[PDB]
Design goal:
The structure is cut from a larger assembly and holds three copies of chain A (451 residues). Chain A is α/β, with parallel strands linked by helices and 451 residues long. Chain A has eleven helices and 22 strands. In chain A, the strands form five sheets. Chain A has a nine-stranded mixed β-sheet. In chain A, strands 11-10-9-8-17-16-20 form a seven-stranded mixed β-sheet. Chain A has a two-stranded parallel sheet with strand order 1-2. At the B-C interface, α3, β11, β16, β17 and α9 of B face β13, β14, β15, β16 and α10 of C. Bound molecules: 7-methyl-guanosine-5'-triphosphate (3 copies), S-adenosyl-L-homocysteine (SAH) (3 copies), magnesium ion (6 copies) and zinc ion (ZN) (3 copies). One zinc ion binds next to β4 of chain B. Chains A, B, C: It is a lipid-anchor.
């Protein structure tokens, strides 16, 4: 019996039960959290990871929040480099909770944990069994398992290699699905988790999930010094989970979209296998095994299975008054996708598609703020399919036109919707051979306060 | 079991229960208060804050109403600078209640409270454990927790820094949502709390919630000495909560719209994290942690999650006979917003939208005095969406026109409505690095009366 | 259990129960009073005031009717200057009732009351504990509470200052709502209380609540010596409550529309807070706290919260044969206002609006004699809204036209209806800084009769 802080009548309960059939999920609502579903998924994921691994194993918790591991019988070594502004609060919460359980919880090594915390406070660079202030690449604690829970600030191959050279043979990554960033979308939603993310350039849009614009009265102006003739995704994105905001980097996010098999070639060499073991409406748990030596061959292909529909479409919005178009991604429940199979046989207008989608949403199966764009997406998709049926080609042929050179062109059709239906797979060519991994943050007053 | 002075059949009861799932909310109506909902929310909020914090903590109550902390087992130090015209009544009520419970309540430190009150009356500058006549920046009582309950007259960063340099590590702010003032609206409503606020310039309007106009026949006159060619929001706004009026300053209101993480850089430096822990139909409880030292990096982005729809729209009204347009904001129940998803797929006239909204309101889900403006808003929003669909742009392009200089302009489209649907987030760029905080009010007759 | 002399089936019972939730209101009809609702409200108001205040307090009763305080256990000092023509009757009734309970009621100080009455009859200037013949500004009895029950003949700031310099710190005012006289209406109704008031100039109208006209054939005559080219509200108004008539002065009526906070600056200075604690369909109880010393700042704004709709509209009537137009105010039940929200989305003729209002009135929710003008009002309001929608302006602009001078006029639109919907607030700028308060009525044989 695992108790999750979500509403009893919530429809995410069924999705969580299907995602974790080996547990008895029961709702025990105690707080009005606006990101309750994400926390519930993380809780169930760490429970599953603990179930899978050997009790005698020692687990590195990279980018840890130590207050969450303090009621765990497992042997966690929490790596806390204090690199984020929210970290001091987490460390203070850990210290307060340890003090509150100092002589009242017996078999959770609370005395050992407070001793290690005081030792790290005394000598910053000491490596205690349960705590340290180092990073993933500077910690010296050898272990058998590594866990990354909502860690997006590390390059995946470098961190994984640095764990592997320390004897780590199993790694676990819990996070948001990295597929929408492999498609290079400008903005997007994980609607089941009340999560909206956007490129920094489109934060002033009007109709995406995460934006804020102003009311204006029109001008042929807004002159600027930046010749922004092109609107393309840049590295910095903003995540909003419920109401908490997190900046992310696209390279770091995409690094965690690892292939099925890859090779880390350093002073030591490792053959690694990445596998998505849990997938619930945009939240995934990935298992990475690492074995010394080079074995087999790598194709460099990462595959995402779509239990629910995944949409990326073009949207026309108004950013700071200026009308632009950019790609927006979302997830659509598989029941909604199945109920639109017959409608998309014909060309449908976005208004008719929206009306049908609202009909299928009756309570609501999917969030309504994403219904318009989805409708638009579907409409475009339907039209494009007709185009393909209308302009049928010949087998074994590919029409090419010369351009007065030893080089030839052809026509690229317009594609305004990528629609991965339920039971399909996205396949992306990514790097699979990594060989270049060669590429003191606590203050005295915080030290005094922790004591 | 927490008892709230609201009607048993009130629909706000379900909203309060959802906002506070950790309590058993029971209606016990004893007075015909016209701002009963706001008082009920404040009561439940202080109960939640008391639940969260350690009993041995000492709590600064900034801008306190000491009569409300008098039946509390917690250790409150009430800071009462007596800068409001409603403060003498509150102090007299506190003294009268203390006298009425001097020898009837045993375990609430009533004797201590009367002793401290008499001590401050004797020597005004004395700093007693439970009472003082200083301000937030002149009080000397060190504490661990600070509470701001309906305090809008202080600059947030300066006050928080002055608490932090006194050892305060946790602060709580209970008050009306600051999002409508981040959008620079001229007038607005919190309809669930019977609250209407307006800029001082539009108090003579006709159809906003808080206004009063006269009956006129129409003249080509009203000549004035002030060249008012622009109608823009000014600093002073008027709040009417039920029937009690409060003047507010826009800058002080907006200062409390703090980012997720920020830095206070003074003689001491603090890394602070602001989090909205309670959000109920326009009334919020925010939790601010403060930790010494500078950690991490700040983006300067403040995020509001919209459980219910938030609307800002253009309204045409008559102020002192003169027809003008200004922005008006409001909150719309999420069920109403969901029920209008299908209708807003096409362009709808404001009259048809109003009739539909009246239909969905049957008892009433939302206040009727806001239905017209909301209807108008929806209509405009629908229209604008279609325009965006009609004038579709190209990906990665941004049309710009030169003006015989090293500058290029473009066309800014129409925005008469900002509609944040349920499960979306507003994101605003605000200051996150604060480093300039360097920027005796009791008379003898009141001293004699208090004794 | 409070018993009210009203009909058991009266619909005012529910309104009174909502206005006084702290009491059990039971109808005990004993007389066919035509102003039974007003008397019932006054009875419940004095009960609530008595409940609120400390039993050991001494209560000034300004402009008292001593027969009503005579079965009161509280310590009332009745101030009876005998300036009204209905006062000798009240004094005789008081003496008769005292005699009738001289040796039959033991614990109501009847012997003391008759002793004080005989003392004042002997020496008119003596200040006895329970009775005096002075005014509010000439009484010398110091007290802690003052009560004004249906007192409209005194300037509010001067009377309140004279009470405050006598140690009075709490004052209560029970009376008809002063909002209709802040809007400067010519005639009006409190229909729940069967009350109609009119300006003296329109007493000869035809279709207002309080008027009487004659039957005429119609002539091009009625010459007069007064160039009455203007019809404006003058000071004198006539109230008819049921069938009892009372002349009132507009200045004295409006003086009691006090701001939320104000300052009395005389030889002593007081900071006063006015708050409306009871509001029932036009009858209000206001609480005024007074504290010595000047504190805070005053805005000068008085706010009225509308639980029911408030209408002021232009009506065309026939006064003494001459067709004129003037403003008429009234209250509309909130259920009627809510049921007309959808209808007022479009332009509706007064006849269709009247038929709809008669339909919603089925027993009757509102008085029928007020339905026509209300209908007309709604119609005009609807039309005006359309105009505001039709003539949409630009944000941040205000069109002004020069007149060959350093002055610029503009166009003032028509306003034929002020409609304060339920859950709105009227805000009026009134005086809040008062500093100029510097601005023997019993005969020998009434004395002999009283003995
Ligand atoms: C550290 N972190 C956490 N999340 C997600 O946001 C949710 C809350 O993230 P949180 O760090 O605010 O949890 P907190 O310590 O405040 O404790 P709680 O409020 O009781 O939950 C988590 O469930 C994650 O799914 C995160 N999401 C992104 N994109 N980036 C991050 O760094 C990140
Ligand atoms: C001090 N203050 C209180 N409020 C809100 O108005 C409501 C009443 O505010 P109040 O100060 O009038 O309460 P009072 O002391 O009269 O006791 P009560 O009548 O029994 O409640 C509160 O619930 C607040 O939500 C306030 N609202 C604004 N905008 N500004 C303020 O300063 C302010
Ligand atoms: C003194 N006075 C009383 N009223 C209202 O008129 C009603 C009756 O006023 P009343 O003075 O005629 O009561 P009376 O002494 O005759 O005893 P009763 O007939 O049993 O009630 C009261 O309920 C008041 O609401 C009053 N109304 C106005 N406008 N002016 C006044 O001076 C005034
Ligand atoms: N290079 C690095 N090596 C190890 N940890 C790092 C790191 N860069 C950032 N981090 C840490 O990663 C953390 C992400 S916040 C993590 C919260 C916690 N893991 C949870 O499950 O809720 C930050 O606290 C930051 O300190
Ligand atoms: N600079 C300042 N420092 C501390 N308090 C201040 C202040 N400026 C104004 N105040 C106080 O803030 C109060 C707001 S009224 C507060 C009422 C009370 N907190 C409640 O919960 O109902 C006023 O009484 C005023 O005295
Ligand atoms: N200046 C003044 N000071 C005190 N009382 C005054 C006054 N001017 C008029 N009054 C008194 O106010 C009274 C209004 S009739 C009041 C009736 C009584 N208060 C009731 O509740 O029914 C008159 O009797 C008149 O004598
Ligand atoms: Mg959150
Ligand atoms: Mg497998
Ligand atoms: Mg109020
Ligand atoms: Mg949080
Ligand atoms: Mg009568
Ligand atoms: Mg109040
Ligand atoms: Zn380590
Ligand atoms: Zn202090
Ligand atoms: Zn007297």
């Amino acid at each position: 019996p695992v108790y999750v802080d979500i509403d009893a009548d919530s429809a995410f309960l069924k999705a969580l039960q299907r995602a974790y059939p080996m547990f008895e999920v029961e709702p025990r609502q105690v707080t009005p959290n606006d990101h309750a579903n994400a926390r519930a998924f993380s809780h169930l994921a760490i429970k599953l990871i603990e179930q899978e691994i050997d009790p005698d194993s020692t687990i590195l918790d990279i980018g840890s929040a130590p207050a969450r591991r303090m009621m765990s019988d497992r042997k966690y070594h929490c790596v806390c480099p204090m690199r984020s502004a929210e970290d001091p609060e987490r460390l203070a919460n850990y210290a307060r909770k340890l003090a509150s359980a100092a002589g009242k919880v017996l078999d959770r090594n609370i005395s050992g944990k407070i001793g290690d915390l005081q030792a790290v406070m005394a000598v910053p660079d000491t490596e205690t069994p349960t705590f340290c202030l180092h990073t993933d690449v500077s910690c010296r604690q050898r272990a058998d398992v590594a866990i990354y829970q909502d860690v997006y600030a590390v390059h995946a191959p470098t961190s994984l290699y640095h764990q592997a050279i320390k004897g780590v043979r199993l790694a676990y990554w819990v996070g948001f699905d990295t597929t929408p960033f492999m498609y290079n979308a400008m903005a997007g939603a994980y609607p089941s988790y009340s999560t909206n993310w956007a490129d920094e350039q489109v934060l002033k849009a009007k109709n995406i999930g995460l934006c804020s614009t102003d009311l204006t009265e029109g001008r042929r102006g807004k002159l600027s010094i930046m010749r922004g003739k092109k609107l393309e995704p840049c590295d910095r994105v903003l995540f909003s989970v419920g109401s908490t905001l997190y900046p992310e980097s696209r390279k770091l996010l995409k690094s965690w979209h690892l292939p099925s098999v890859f090779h880390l070639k350093g002073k030591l060499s490792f053959t690694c296998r990445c596998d998505t073991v849990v997938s619930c409406e945009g939240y995934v748990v990935k298992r990475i095994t690492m074995s010394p030596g080079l074995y087999g061959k790598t194709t460099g292909y990462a595959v995402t299975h779509h239990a629910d529909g995944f949409l990326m479409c073009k949207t026309t919005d108004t950013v700071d008054g200026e009308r632009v178009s950019f790609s927006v991604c979302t997830y659509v429940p598989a029941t909604i996708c199945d109920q639109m199979t017959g409608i998309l046989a014909t060309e449908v207008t976005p208004e008719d598609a929206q009306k049908l989608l609202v009909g299928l949403n009756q309570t609501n199966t999917m969030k309504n703020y994403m219904i318009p764009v989805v409708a638009q997406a579907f409409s475009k998709w339907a039209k494009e399919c007709r185009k393909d049926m209308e302009d049928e080609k010949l087998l074994g042929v590919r029409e090419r036109t010369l351009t007065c050179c030893c080089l030839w062109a052809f026509k690229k059709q317009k594609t305004h919707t990528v629609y991965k239906r339920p039971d399909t797979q996205s396949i992306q060519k990514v790097q699979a051979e990594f060989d270049s991994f060669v590429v003191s943050g606590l203050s005295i007053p915080l030290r005094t306060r922790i004591k």
